[PDB]
Amino acid sequence: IAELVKLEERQRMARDLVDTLGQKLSLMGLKSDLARKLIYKDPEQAARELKSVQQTARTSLNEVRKIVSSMKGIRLKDELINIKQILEAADIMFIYEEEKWPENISLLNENILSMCLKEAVTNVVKHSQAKTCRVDIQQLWKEVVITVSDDGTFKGEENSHGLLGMRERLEFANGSLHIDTENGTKLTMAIPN
Amino acid sequence: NERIAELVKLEERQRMARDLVDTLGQKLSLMGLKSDLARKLIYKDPEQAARELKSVQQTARTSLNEVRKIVSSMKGIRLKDELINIKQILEAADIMFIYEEEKWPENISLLNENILSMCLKEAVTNVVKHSQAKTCRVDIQQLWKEVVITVSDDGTFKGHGLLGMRERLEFANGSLHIDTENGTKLTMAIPN
Ligand SMILES: Nc1ncnc2c1ncn2[C@@H]1O[C@H](COP(=O)(O)OP(=O)(O)O)[C@@H](O)[C@H]1O
Ligand SMILES: Nc1ncnc2c1ncn2[C@@H]1O[C@H](COP(=O)(O)OP(=O)(O)O)[C@@H](O)[C@H]1O
Numbered sequence A: 001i002a003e004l005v006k007l008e009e010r011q012r013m014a015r016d017l018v019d020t021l022g023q024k025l026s027l028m029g030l031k032s033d034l035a036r037k038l039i040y041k042d043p044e045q046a047a048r049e050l051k052s053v054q055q056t057a058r059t060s061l062n063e064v065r066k067i068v069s070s071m072k073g074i075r076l077k078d079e080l081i082n083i084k085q086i087l088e089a090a091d092i093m094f095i096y097e098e099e100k101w102p103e104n105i106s107l108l109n110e111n112i113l114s115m116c117l118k119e120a121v122t123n124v125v126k127h128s129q130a131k132t133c134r135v136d137i138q139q140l141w142k143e144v145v146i147t148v149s150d151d152g153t154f155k156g157e158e159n160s161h162g163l164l165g166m167r168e169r170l171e172f173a174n175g176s177l178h179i180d181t182e183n184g185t186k187l188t189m190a191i192p193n
Numbered sequence B: 001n002e003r004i005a006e007l008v009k010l011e012e013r014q015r016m017a018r019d020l021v022d023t024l025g026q027k028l029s030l031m032g033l034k035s036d037l038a039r040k041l042i043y044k045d046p047e048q049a050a051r052e053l054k055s056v057q058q059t060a061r062t063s064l065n066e067v068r069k070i071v072s073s074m075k076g077i078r079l080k081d082e083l084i085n086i087k088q089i090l091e092a093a094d095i096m097f098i099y100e101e102e103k104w105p106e107n108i109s110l111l112n113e114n115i116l117s118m119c120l121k122e123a124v125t126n127v128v129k130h131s132q133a134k135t136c137r138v139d140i141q142q143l144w145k146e147v148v149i150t151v152s153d154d155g156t157f158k159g160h161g162l163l164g165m166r167e168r169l170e171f172a173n174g175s176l177h178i179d180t181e182n183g184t185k186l187t188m189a190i191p192n
């Protein structure tokens, strides 16, 4: 029926959401308990744990909210085709040495990495004045690591809206963002896999 | 059509997956609101803060327990099937089954059918093991914004099951009421 064949991927996305929300609920449960045990002992620390529970809740809902209707996100292979066309239109040479594609990556995590990849490249175009942009995608043991390196110049002050958005979605997936702006801008994004 | 049949199966599984996402989201948001409230009360009223956080813990525990069993298959029990099951149990028990068919609830989540099915099963099991009843009446009603199942037997109340029922109905934002005035009547209600 075709239209029902795409339900297979929507189902994989829905399961990923169930899995992630389950883990967040569970973490929030553990922190509320610890906080409860500090109420009298250490009320300032108790407040801080609960502020963290609140942030987990808000950020999780924030990350799930946009996916839930369609149960569809961006595929990393398509985003790679996309950012190659963006660099070409910008006349910035795309450098990519293809290695073994990551194998067992959740659709949620592909969407997160795709959005980060898109934002990183968008910044190369808008801010870097780079001549080149190298994209590395690595399956590294238990993680996937994408490095976006441009040979332009970093234009920012100390700060981090793109960069905060990336850090937030990556840390929601228990991954991380590193930025090095010494000689061009190298963005390293790592997510569990 | 040979494949289309089986793809409607994924259709129901996807509907259950969505119900779980929706319910886990709701609970996450509830626990957030309750945590924030506990936070604001740490100094004015630490006792209430403690109780709001105990309630947060309970919501976490029970939510994960209700999801745990469904997640792998994304499949629950359908209420129509459980009604058939309980009729056959009541027949083996030689307890008269009283059921007047009315309009079936139109738009009940698969998650909520599973919860109602489990409660209906436990209610009738209790009729069979405990009541010494001769009749068992089952009513299933769409009443405005809720579905209500009533299970009434003509035995005598003798007082696992009852708290399990109460927890799962409360997880779906509904309720359990027991009336033991003249036999045992369980009214279970769930939003819909
Ligand atoms: N690849 C890059 N090359 C040079 N400067 C950058 C790069 N990425 C980000 N920046 C700098 O850091 C700032 C913050 O990035 P971002 O968070 O996307 O905000 P915005 O694009 O809306 O300025 C940018 O305004 C820019 O000054
Ligand atoms: N339909 C019923 N008729 C009579 N007594 C009941 C009925 N349902 C529950 N009870 C009483 O309440 C007790 C608690 O029931 P339940 O929670 O299901 O635990 P259990 O069946 O394991 O005792 C029963 O043991 C019984 O004493």
Ligand SMILES: [Ca+2]
Pocket: A119, A122, A123, A161, A162, A163
């Ligand atoms: Ca930007």
Ligand SMILES: [Ca+2]
Pocket: B122, B125, B126, B160, B161, B162
């Ligand atoms: Ca029982």
